[PDB]
Write a protein that holds these residues in place. Structure first.
Motif, PDB file in Angstrom:
ATOM      1  N   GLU A 188       0.377  -2.310  -5.886  1.00 48.10           N
ATOM      2  CA  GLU A 188       1.259  -3.389  -6.313  1.00 48.10           C
ATOM      3  C   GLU A 188       2.506  -3.448  -5.443  1.00 48.10           C
ATOM      4  N   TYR A 189       3.070  -2.288  -5.101  1.00 50.71           N
ATOM      5  CA  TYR A 189       4.230  -2.286  -4.216  1.00 50.71           C
ATOM      6  C   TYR A 189       3.876  -2.870  -2.852  1.00 50.71           C
ATOM      7  N   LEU A 190       2.826  -2.341  -2.216  1.00 50.64           N
ATOM      8  CA  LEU A 190       2.478  -2.830  -0.885  1.00 50.64           C
ATOM      9  C   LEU A 190       2.032  -4.288  -0.910  1.00 50.64           C
ATOM     10  N   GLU A 191       1.596  -4.794  -2.067  1.00 52.66           N
ATOM     11  CA  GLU A 191       1.326  -6.222  -2.198  1.00 52.66           C
ATOM     12  C   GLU A 191       2.625  -7.011  -2.270  1.00 52.66           C
ATOM     13  N   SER A 192       3.589  -6.526  -3.056  1.00 53.89           N
ATOM     14  CA  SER A 192       4.909  -7.144  -3.075  1.00 53.89           C
ATOM     15  C   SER A 192       5.502  -7.210  -1.675  1.00 53.89           C
ATOM     16  N   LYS A 193       5.184  -6.232  -0.828  1.00 47.26           N
ATOM     17  CA  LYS A 193       5.648  -6.225   0.553  1.00 47.26           C
ATOM     18  C   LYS A 193       4.771  -7.060   1.485  1.00 47.26           C
ATOM     19  N   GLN A 194       3.799  -7.804   0.951  1.00 48.29           N
ATOM     20  CA  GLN A 194       2.881  -8.601   1.769  1.00 48.29           C
ATOM     21  C   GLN A 194       2.184  -7.741   2.824  1.00 48.29           C
ATOM     22  N   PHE A 195       1.974  -6.467   2.507  1.00 44.62           N
ATOM     23  CA  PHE A 195       1.296  -5.519   3.381  1.00 44.62           C
ATOM     24  C   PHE A 195      -0.080  -5.219   2.804  1.00 44.62           C
ATOM     25  N   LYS A 232     -12.719 -11.728   6.981  1.00 45.41           N
ATOM     26  CA  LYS A 232     -11.532 -12.357   6.417  1.00 45.41           C
ATOM     27  C   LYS A 232     -10.863 -11.419   5.420  1.00 45.41           C
ATOM     28  N   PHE A 233     -10.366 -10.284   5.902  1.00 42.09           N
ATOM     29  CA  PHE A 233      -9.677  -9.341   5.034  1.00 42.09           C
ATOM     30  C   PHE A 233      -8.464 -10.005   4.392  1.00 42.09           C
ATOM     31  N   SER A 234      -8.083  -9.511   3.219  1.00 42.00           N
ATOM     32  CA  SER A 234      -6.967 -10.089   2.480  1.00 42.00           C
ATOM     33  C   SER A 234      -6.645  -9.191   1.291  1.00 42.00           C
ATOM     34  N   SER A 235      -5.630  -9.603   0.526  1.00 40.53           N
ATOM     35  CA  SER A 235      -5.285  -8.885  -0.694  1.00 40.53           C
ATOM     36  C   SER A 235      -6.462  -8.839  -1.657  1.00 40.53           C
ATOM     37  N   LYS A 236      -7.303  -9.875  -1.658  1.00 39.98           N
ATOM     38  CA  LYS A 236      -8.520  -9.827  -2.461  1.00 39.98           C
ATOM     39  C   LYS A 236      -9.437  -8.704  -1.992  1.00 39.98           C
ATOM     40  N   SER A 237      -9.527  -8.499  -0.676  1.00 38.83           N
ATOM     41  CA  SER A 237     -10.319  -7.389  -0.157  1.00 38.83           C
ATOM     42  C   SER A 237      -9.715  -6.052  -0.564  1.00 38.83           C
ATOM     43  N   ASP A 238      -8.384  -5.949  -0.539  1.00 43.86           N
ATOM     44  CA  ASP A 238      -7.737  -4.725  -1.004  1.00 43.86           C
ATOM     45  C   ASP A 238      -8.020  -4.485  -2.483  1.00 43.86           C
ATOM     46  N   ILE A 239      -8.080  -5.554  -3.277  1.00 39.68           N
ATOM     47  CA  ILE A 239      -8.384  -5.413  -4.698  1.00 39.68           C
ATOM     48  C   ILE A 239      -9.825  -4.952  -4.891  1.00 39.68           C
ATOM     49  N   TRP A 240     -10.746  -5.498  -4.096  1.00 34.50           N
ATOM     50  CA  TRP A 240     -12.126  -5.020  -4.112  1.00 34.50           C
ATOM     51  C   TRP A 240     -12.183  -3.527  -3.807  1.00 34.50           C
ATOM     52  N   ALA A 241     -11.485  -3.106  -2.750  1.00 37.73           N
ATOM     53  CA  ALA A 241     -11.468  -1.693  -2.389  1.00 37.73           C
ATOM     54  C   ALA A 241     -10.837  -0.844  -3.485  1.00 37.73           C
ATOM     55  N   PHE A 242      -9.831  -1.376  -4.183  1.00 42.79           N
ATOM     56  CA  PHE A 242      -9.222  -0.630  -5.280  1.00 42.79           C
ATOM     57  C   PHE A 242     -10.192  -0.474  -6.443  1.00 42.79           C
ATOM     58  N   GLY A 243     -10.972  -1.516  -6.730  1.00 42.37           N
ATOM     59  CA  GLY A 243     -12.016  -1.382  -7.731  1.00 42.37           C
ATOM     60  C   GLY A 243     -13.033  -0.323  -7.352  1.00 42.37           C
TER      61      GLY A 243
END
Ligand SMILES: C[C@H]1CN(C2COC2)CCN1c1ccc(Nc2cc(-c3ccnc(N4CCn5c(cc6c5CC(C)(C)C6)C4=O)c3CO)cn(C)c2=O)nc1
Ligand SMILES: C[C@H]1CN(C2COC2)CCN1c1ccc(Nc2cc(-c3ccnc(N4CCn5c(cc6c5CC(C)(C)C6)C4=O)c3CO)cn(C)c2=O)nc1
Lengths: 438, 438
Positions: free
Chosen positions: A289-296, A352-363
């Motif tokens: 969540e932090y690194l998402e807030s940072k658009q990272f 097309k990596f993105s925050s959605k891809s990061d969410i997939w990886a977090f799952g």
């Protein structure tokens, strides 16, 4: 047999020789009980005689024996007598109600506090102190009972308080001095170089990460080094600095005693329990969540890419270092070292990596945390995994995962990226399920 | 512009010349706010410099500044640290929760008291003191706040306390002495004789009812006089006794200053209000419930047959005196003086009076109380009234009667006698609607 006793509601002077003198407040023991209006009783002085039934108050009838309860009093008459009285506590029947007056403020204010009855024969009141300040309430309970097991006058704090990771070893101290670095032991090897645990100035536990020749793009890395240094969070490894003057440039970061959480769950299974992996997932989600807030974008999120410290708290690491990888077999989407297990549909297809891809990886990370480290799709291959992800297949439910956390990590794997949850709401749901478990 | 300030979470020694020394407990005023990990602040001593963002606590963040709140603490870990602490008040985030230990009782007992948040930004706790004793609770609030407008230390009692009617002027004193009777004035005339207000022994306000020749069956009356004397209730006129030695036998009863409630509502309309007739009906219903418990039937229930005293409380009278009437036109069901207005179906048809008939008459009494005394069926006659009661017609709703009380007095008029309510449940419903009105 059993003996009965009542209180003297009023005072009575015997108009007849067969009567007994009642005196308000003098309890009398009824000798016989009947349905007639007069019954024989005995007094403490020792005299007995018949007395009116309209002057006796049962032991449990002490409510009427008091000068407050008034069955006749209503929610209106009581306020009319409380205004003429002008804070008077008056009780009335209604299983009861209480009225008090307000005193400054010449316009009389009356309250109708109702008395509630517990199913267990107890009594209470539907009123809250309404403390607008948490420490004020804590102080109140500290010097009061408030129906608590004990007064809140025994703080429960700990003496094992360690300061947090210094956001860098000094302000504007982007360049660490190898002379200060005090290399101690070795922590293994990484994708780009070799690691070793040392101490900055011999007084700060740091982990030096020396690079490998032709493994990372040191130029671009140093270019965005200030950026990656501006990233700081509790559940995020704290990059202390980089020694660029020397070769190989040494990335001095925070030290984690347990190392990769992946091996922590696959070998160090004698230090945690099945009721803590949820807290581990909470930590990971906070970092995300932090690194998402940072658009990272972490880019590579997995138990292997997460570390654990002596306190047992997990933290993400190697955040966004992919951009500085030289192994084509790992960078390319079709390479061999590419983590297709954690990759996402759009990634594996069009890159097309993105925050959605990061969410997939977090799952996927949550799934493997609940699986104790088992590799996702142990039976399938790089191509069959994509086949099954496209058909609609999803990772199964670990034996230790509740249906709730499974639904969470499943929502993390929504086919439509635009529909995948955000890390903020994921953390909210994780906290909810945690409070429910506890 | 606006100035910001925070507390020193921990203590920090400047490792760099561009840093400021943080000291736990020393508030610092942030000079600039950004997203970087270090921000410049100023100290009370007057020195300013950059300091870590992980060491500051917002003013509203004082929750963390305290040594109790622990966001990491859960409903399980908190109990594990509270058992090792072995009553420790520890607060945790969850909008929060509190835990205390129990001390005798070596088996440690832990409580998880949750902190509730008011919609108006206040805070409270879902906990009740659970006083199993009403006066104990009154004493507690008397010496405590408990979120009350004021302490319950101002009793609201009255000095106008008058003893109740003596169940007879002495025990076993069924025969009053005319010599003791102190006739004062006249109260009018009755169906059987003439009334007059006097004083027994010149010290007890009594109402003598002298009989009329050939008006009542004095023999049967004296036979059941002990029975009717055994009837005693607050909302029931208190028969003091009967002078039978003299002719006409004098029925000395309780005195009521206002007289018949019927005339009280039809002439004395300058002493009550529209919010008190409900209490009048409650009084009547209490009297009826008592005489029902006694398996006694009023036989003739109506505002005319009810009296009112100086305090304004209404009480039934002439309970069951019909059995001692000599006027055929009044006793017979088809007579002229018979109260068909209050009579019931089975009564008017087969002369099967009963508690159901008394309930019908009580419903009629409530209707007329709410009508201010208007006669039931002012337009109809003795035969048309029975016609309409058989067809299904019922008395209309007075302009002052709510639909609830109308439904009550309508249930009182159920065609099937076996379905008519009981006086106990009628009193329960009257109390319910009274508490609702108030
Ligand atoms: C667990 C014990 C067990 N002990 C045995 C038992 O008796 C002996 C030996 C020591 N061992 C141990 C202890 C502590 C630690 N802690 C630390 C590990 C690492 C570390 C080590 C090796 N490889 C890596 N990786 C692995 C990930 N990754 C790297 C680079 C890249 C990646 C992914 C990429 C593609 C983005 C690029 C990369 O560098 C890392 C993470 O940076 C870094 N930091 C800061 C530490 O504090 N580790 C291991
Ligand atoms: C209201 C003021 C007004 N005031 C005016 C204003 O300036 C002068 C004059 C006085 N007046 C007044 C005051 C007080 C009282 N109180 C009392 C009345 C009566 C009373 C009087 C006349 N008739 C009756 N009834 C009427 C009912 N009933 C009787 C016998 C029977 C019935 C029905 C039956 C069929 C069962 C048989 C019967 O006797 C009664 C009730 O017993 C009895 N008792 C005990 C009182 O205390 N009454 C009237």
């Amino acid at each position: 047999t059993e003996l009965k006793k009542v209180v003297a509601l009023y005072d009575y002077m015997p108009m007849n020789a067969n009567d007994l003198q009642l005196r308000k407040g003098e309890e009398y023991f009824i000798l016989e009980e009947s349905n007639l209006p007069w019954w024989r009783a005995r007094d403490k002085n020792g005299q007995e005689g018949y007395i009116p039934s309209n002057y006796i108050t049962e032991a449990e009838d002490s409510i009427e024996m008091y000068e407050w309860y008034s069955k006749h009093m209503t929610r209106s008459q009581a306020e009319q007598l409380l205004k003429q009285a002008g804070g008077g506590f008056i009780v009335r029947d209604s299983k009861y109600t209480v009225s008090v007056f307000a005193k400054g403020e010449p316009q009389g204010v009356i309250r109708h506090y109702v008395v509630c009855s517990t199913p267990q024969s107890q009594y209470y009141l539907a009123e809250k102190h309404l403390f607008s300040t948490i420490p004020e309430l804590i102080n109140y309970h500290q010097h009061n009972s408030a129906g608590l097991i004990s007064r809140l006058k025994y703080p429960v704090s700990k003496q094992n308080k360690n300061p947090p990771p210094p956001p860098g070893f000094g302000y504007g101290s982007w360049e660490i001095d190898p002379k200060d670095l005090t290399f101690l032991k070795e922590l293994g090897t990484g994708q780009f170089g070799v690691v070793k645990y040392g101490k900055w100035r011999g007084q700060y536990d740091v982990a030096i990460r020396m690079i490998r020749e032709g493994s990372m793009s040191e130029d671009e890395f140093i270019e965005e080094a200030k950026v990656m240094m501006n990233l700081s969070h509790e559940k995020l490894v704290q990059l202390y600095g980089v020694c660029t003057k020397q070769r190989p440039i040494f990335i001095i970061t925070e030290y984690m005693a347990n190392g990769c959480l992946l091996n922590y769950l696959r070998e160090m299974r004698h230090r945690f329990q099945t009721q803590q992996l949820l807290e581990m997932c909470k930590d990971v989600c906070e970092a995300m969540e932090y690194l998402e807030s940072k658009q990272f974008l972490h880019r590579d999120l997995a138990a292997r890419n997460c570390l654990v410290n002596d306190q047992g708290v997990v933290k993400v690491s190697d955040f966004g270092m992919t951009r500085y990888v030289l192994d084509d077999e790992y960078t390319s989407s079709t390479g061999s070292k590419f983590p297709v297990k954690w990759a996402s549909p759009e990634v594996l297809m069009y890159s097309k990596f993105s925050s959605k891809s990061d969410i997939w990886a977090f799952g996927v990370l949550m799934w493997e945390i609940y699986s104790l480290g088992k590799m996702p799709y142990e039976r399938f291959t790089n191509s069959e995994t994509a086949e099954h992800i496209a058909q609609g297949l999803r990772l199964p439910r670990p034996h230790l995962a509740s249906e709730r956390v499974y639904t969470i990590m499943y929502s993390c794997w929504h086919e439509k990226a635009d529909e995948r949850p955000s890390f903020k709401i994921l953390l909210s749901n994780i906290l909810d399920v945690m409070d429910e478990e506890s």
